[PDB]
Design a protein around this ligand. Sequence first.
Ligand SMILES: CC(C)(COP(=O)(O)OP(=O)(O)OC[C@H]1O[C@@H](n2cnc3c(N)ncnc32)[C@H](O)[C@@H]1OP(=O)(O)O)[C@@H](O)C(=O)NCCC(=O)NCCS
Ligand SMILES: CC(C)(COP(=O)(O)OP(=O)(O)OC[C@H]1O[C@@H](n2cnc3c(N)ncnc32)[C@H](O)[C@@H]1OP(=O)(O)O)[C@@H](O)C(=O)NCCC(=O)NCCS
Ligand SMILES: CC(C)(COP(=O)(O)OP(=O)(O)OC[C@H]1O[C@@H](n2cnc3c(N)ncnc32)[C@H](O)[C@@H]1OP(=O)(O)O)[C@@H](O)C(=O)NCCC(=O)NCCS
Ligand SMILES: Cc1cn([C@H]2C[C@H](O)[C@@H](COP(=O)(O)OP(=O)(O)O[C@H]3O[C@H](C)[C@@H](O)[C@H](N)[C@H]3O)O2)c(=O)[nH]c1=O
Ligand SMILES: Cc1cn([C@H]2C[C@H](O)[C@@H](COP(=O)(O)OP(=O)(O)O[C@H]3O[C@H](C)[C@@H](O)[C@H](N)[C@H]3O)O2)c(=O)[nH]c1=O
Ligand SMILES: Cc1cn([C@H]2C[C@H](O)[C@@H](COP(=O)(O)OP(=O)(O)O[C@H]3O[C@H](C)[C@@H](O)[C@H](N)[C@H]3O)O2)c(=O)[nH]c1=O
Lengths: 145, 145, 145
Amino acid sequence: GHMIHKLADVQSKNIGSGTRIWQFCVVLPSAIIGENCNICSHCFIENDVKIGNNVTIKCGVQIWDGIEIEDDVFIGPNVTFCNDKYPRSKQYPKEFSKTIIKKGASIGANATILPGITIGENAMIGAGAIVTKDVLPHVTYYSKI
Amino acid sequence: GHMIHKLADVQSKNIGSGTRIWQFCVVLPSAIIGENCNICSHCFIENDVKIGNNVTIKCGVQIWDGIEIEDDVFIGPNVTFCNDKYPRSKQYPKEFSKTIIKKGASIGANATILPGITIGENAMIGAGAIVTKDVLPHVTYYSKI
Amino acid sequence: GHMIHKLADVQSKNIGSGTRIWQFCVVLPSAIIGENCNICSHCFIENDVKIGNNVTIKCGVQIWDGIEIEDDVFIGPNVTFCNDKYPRSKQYPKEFSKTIIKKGASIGANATILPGITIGENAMIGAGAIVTKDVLPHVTYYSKI
Ligand SMILES: CC(C)(COP(=O)(O)OP(=O)(O)OC[C@H]1O[C@@H](n2cnc3c(N)ncnc32)[C@H](O)[C@@H]1OP(=O)(O)O)[C@@H](O)C(=O)NCCC(=O)NCCS
Ligand SMILES: CC(C)(COP(=O)(O)OP(=O)(O)OC[C@H]1O[C@@H](n2cnc3c(N)ncnc32)[C@H](O)[C@@H]1OP(=O)(O)O)[C@@H](O)C(=O)NCCC(=O)NCCS
Ligand SMILES: CC(C)(COP(=O)(O)OP(=O)(O)OC[C@H]1O[C@@H](n2cnc3c(N)ncnc32)[C@H](O)[C@@H]1OP(=O)(O)O)[C@@H](O)C(=O)NCCC(=O)NCCS
Ligand SMILES: Cc1cn([C@H]2C[C@H](O)[C@@H](COP(=O)(O)OP(=O)(O)O[C@H]3O[C@H](C)[C@@H](O)[C@H](N)[C@H]3O)O2)c(=O)[nH]c1=O
Ligand SMILES: Cc1cn([C@H]2C[C@H](O)[C@@H](COP(=O)(O)OP(=O)(O)O[C@H]3O[C@H](C)[C@@H](O)[C@H](N)[C@H]3O)O2)c(=O)[nH]c1=O
Ligand SMILES: Cc1cn([C@H]2C[C@H](O)[C@@H](COP(=O)(O)OP(=O)(O)O[C@H]3O[C@H](C)[C@@H](O)[C@H](N)[C@H]3O)O2)c(=O)[nH]c1=O
């Protein structure tokens, strides 16, 4: 009982009941997605990826290898994640940096999350923020304009 | 006399003459789009949405419920809008916050527009800006780097 | 010997051996793309565009007319480029501003590159940065948070 749009390319069988995956999403085979998620249009979800239950991923987000999203997380549109702190074309690290977005946290629209980051339970990341350090549980963080 | 790309999912009949809607766009049924718009690839346009005439929406933009775009507006690529100031997964507000981008205004590439915002007529929003307060008509606003 | 995903719209024949172009990409006819590039999902590549060899373009990037990418460049996800410094809807300039990203340079996730910019060889642009001035060769530049 999950809904995969005919215009998505979903290669993972590991998708929970109630989850919706919308148009022009790519989901690679090893991705794990929980129950009652909403994966909005134009998202990319790689292999070494775990996403919990009741997660909302708005449009235009990519979830790279090494990223874990816990239950009840909200990820705003065009939010960007990283798994490589010093990227150079065709220079593959032995191991990708890991990011974890902990239960109930929310990431505002168009925020940028550096590699290796923990965002604590129920944190709120302001729209457009750059997150270069871990954010503590329940903290509201935004970049000064 | 409007052009919907075969690789778009356009569900709205409310689309003006001369409008182009490009590959991998999603446009939901209640969306209103005026004449001679250009809705570039990879855009998402929701239901409670009004877009005027001669509007340019570059690639990778989402126009959420509660957002109105007036005539002659330019929206740069990967510009992000918001309709929920304190987003939590599966916590639906009674009413979405409204944003209006007034006639002739321009929003630079990758800008972030907070919910509830008015951008005045002929304003210019710098590339990458975070807009947390209304922008007055004809004002050039950008976030200090 | 190049791989074009069946869910991409690639109109250019000017694509080097070993290049991969993934789902939901648009590549217009005059685009030039070198050998062993990886053009990830959800990218847009216009006509007056030259991209060298061994270039990585992560998801959700648009490469506009007037932009040149040299060999061995890395472009992070949701990176945004510009070819028009004072955009107004339907006001087409005689000439688009040119941007060049020089050999081996890397642009972090969700960075914004203003029009007319040179990013020098082997530079590193931090995630989320706004680049309003040329970046010198081998320099690490990021926007203060
Ligand atoms: C971070 C946020 C929760 C803060 O809301 P708040 O605590 O009510 O803060 P206020 O609106 O009272 O603003 C306090 C100050 O911080 C600034 N500020 C607020 N959000 C900001 C942001 N995202 N980036 C930068 N500055 C921000 C305001 O400009 C204000 O500055 P001032 O004191 O100089 O006037 C909210 O503004 C936000 O970014 N929400 C996320 C929206 C979103 O992305 N939704 C998902 C898509 S719908
Ligand atoms: C905002 C904008 C219109 C200002 O242009 P301008 O008034 O000619 O300003 P200048 O280039 O003279 O720059 C003035 C100062 O503001 C800074 N600045 C300009 N644009 C900025 C931006 N978007 N964000 C942050 N700082 C910016 C410059 O770095 C310069 O700083 P300095 O005085 O310390 O050297 C322009 O830079 C811009 O962002 N244009 C939008 C481009 C775009 O997104 N096009 C759509 C896609 S093609
Ligand atoms: C720019 C970058 C290379 C700098 O790494 P570094 O030189 O190791 O810098 P550090 O982590 O030691 O940070 C130095 C300081 O700059 C700040 N900083 C680092 N990167 C920043 C960024 N992108 N934006 C703003 N501030 C940043 C840190 O917060 C720190 O501030 P502090 O001294 O006040 O504590 C790196 O942080 C980065 O942005 N990498 C790109 C990641 C990416 O986009 N990958 C592609 C997708 S996988
Ligand atoms: C019909 C349809 C829907 N969608 C996605 C995008 C659309 O905004 C979303 C609607 O589902 P929802 O469950 O009503 O909304 P969601 O939980 O994703 O987000 C909404 O509610 C939260 C609470 C707000 O913060 C958010 N800003 C809202 O968009 O599903 C698509 O991507 N394609 C579609 O065709
Ligand atoms: C052929 C084709 C076009 N498009 C979109 C994306 C492409 O950049 C645009 C070209 O149409 P246009 O009317 O020539 O250009 P637009 O008005 O969108 O923007 C151009 O002009 C304005 C004035 C500049 O600020 C802007 N930076 C330019 O891109 O249409 C697509 O999305 N897919 C396509 O296949
Ligand atoms: C199978 C498949 C792959 N891709 C794209 C997106 C995916 O992340 C990438 C994998 O190819 P790669 O050559 O393994 O990785 P890439 O060089 O693009 O990037 C990886 O390595 C560099 C060194 C890191 O900085 C980067 N963060 C990594 O993603 O190819 C797609 O877009 N669709 C797909 O179906």
